[model samples]
Target: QPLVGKQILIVEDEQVFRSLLDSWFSSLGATTVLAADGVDALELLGGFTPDLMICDIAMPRMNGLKLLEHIRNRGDQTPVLVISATENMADIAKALRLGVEDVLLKPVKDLNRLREMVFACLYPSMFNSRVEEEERLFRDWDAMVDNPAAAAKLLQELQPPVQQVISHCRVNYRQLVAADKPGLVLDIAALSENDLAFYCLDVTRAGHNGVLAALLLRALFNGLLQEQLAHQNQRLPELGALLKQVNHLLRQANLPGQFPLLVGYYHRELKNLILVSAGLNATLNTGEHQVQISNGVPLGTLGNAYLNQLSQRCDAWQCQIWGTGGRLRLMLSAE
Candidate 1:
């Protein structure tokens, strides 16, 4: 409806698409000027500057990119819309570098939608907030990288009760927060090779330390459990033994009392779980899939103290564990 008096430039080589684009814009009450390709479009630009330029990539006598670059370099302020055949982000990124507004995939499903784009481009509001934030953070870091003293000085200024939850899940915090969407989602993100085993930890050490533990566990399991199953010539590995070994190593590190942490483990395939202070949450799912958690002392207590643990089938699907520090809730989705 806000299409009247608007001017649109269409630079497409093929007659089929060129004619349709012309009809689409004309029907919306805008003036359309179709060019065979970029070469001809530049000739048109000399005499008439349109509100928007809709272009296709594959063309003869200079491609759409050439026309777009020309307009950008010549100080033209036209908003160029590129309708390319491929979905390669590289191409889209290149267009963005050359001053293209937006790139649409070929075989567009709706023409009126194209009109809406034109109007919006002509009168747009709001931009990508995440992109702006990313730029801001990157700029700050880029500036601080060369000045270590300044950087460290700025970083050291922090408030009390500071804690970090570092994960190698590869997904950002936002994705992790929204991972509970429709359909099944399994994020054994910390598990090691083939996902045979995985564990979550509240830690005082870096994430790489946990990753190392997983690999170490893998070798230990293969040597102990795998060998026992294969030859039936030795005693099977004990859950208590496994937990004890972990606690022993962690104790040797002598973690600080202020940074005491909990650890929980899951054995995949069999879907069995064993947790230490992970049971901090005494109970979970108040009305459903009831589970009991632990608040008892765990490993690495410095003096005389014992580590409490729980081993279960993981069938509850929802539960809570009680711990001295706090409660930990666990949820199991069929997926």
Candidate 2:
């Protein structure tokens, strides 16, 4: 019963699909409310707050997109997952703009994938071999509350090694923190024998709030990467779509403020690096070719316009990125 104690709202005009979802979630120990259309869903929403919402786009009265706009306008950040038959990029982009969790094509053929996506929304992954340190910090709150240095040291210890090799690529990393400021989390994980995923989440707020936000963001990052790689085809999702998913999840989590984030991956065989930056002040260089990624807006913002730069891939012999901010500087390299 992974969804035990959870409540889910299903909004679909098709009675068959609506009933299917209601049965599915109810069996998984979740209390479910079903609505035949967007208008009905909204009326129900006035009196019901669910942990998640599964919606269909084409509905009578108010369409799914308009309902989403209405909820967002009213500051309702409950996570919404859109399941529809439409393949219109414009509609997809509009849904992304509204910050829905992720849009799944209609007549979903893969139940496992749907389950994984829903499970991720309900209970995000927080494990990465760093749980021991997390437990230590959580068990002894005074260790972090009473001593800032102790907390900082513990947080630093949670980071991956400064240098490591994933398949054929060697990576060198450094995180420099200011005297009074705290450091955030940076992770590099192997996606397969010939590829790897990496990200750095730098939050604006400090103290325990920032710490928790950074950890949650990293967990969601890891979960998203793994979900993509889990497919048998091993094809990575578009960088823009990936970023949109992260932004939606973060917004629904209701964390404080936007985040400076860098999400990317490297292909060991092709030597191609695909990167995206969200308000992360950084630049990447390979020999004389350089890409300045300092212009994009921060992640978890309100709209999808800032993600104009999509999956831009660069071929390189040696590559390095310099990430800068007021309190920290990060250097990452691969060759």
Candidate with best lDDT? 2
Model 1 segments more than 4 A misplaced: 87-89, 125-335
C-alpha local distance difference test of each model = 0.48, 0.64
lDDT of 1 at 106: 62
TM-scores for all candidates? 0.41, 0.51
Question: What residue pairs clash in candidate 2, if any at all?
Answer: none
Question: What is the RMSD of candidate 1?
Answer: 18.0
Q: Give the alpha carbon lDDT tens digit for every residue of 1-335 in model 2.
A: 76898899998988888888888888999999988877898899989998988989988899999998899899997878788866343565566556766666665656776787777666645322243333233334433445656655655656777777765667666555533344446777776677777776664433454555465444345445555455333565456667777666655545446676777777756656777777666566655576676547767576756655434444443323333433333333444
Q: Write the per-residue lDDT of candidate 1 for residues 1-335, one digit (tens) a residue.
A: 45688889999988988898898778878888989988899899888879988899878789887787788789886777778664333444356456555556566645654555566666554333432322222223324434545443432231111122212111111112222111111113323321222233332222223222222222223222232233333222243344454444443323223222334444444555555442123443323345555444433443423355566664324444322323334444322
In angstroms, how far off is 78's CA in candidate 2? 27
Worst 10 residues of 1 by lDDT: 178-187
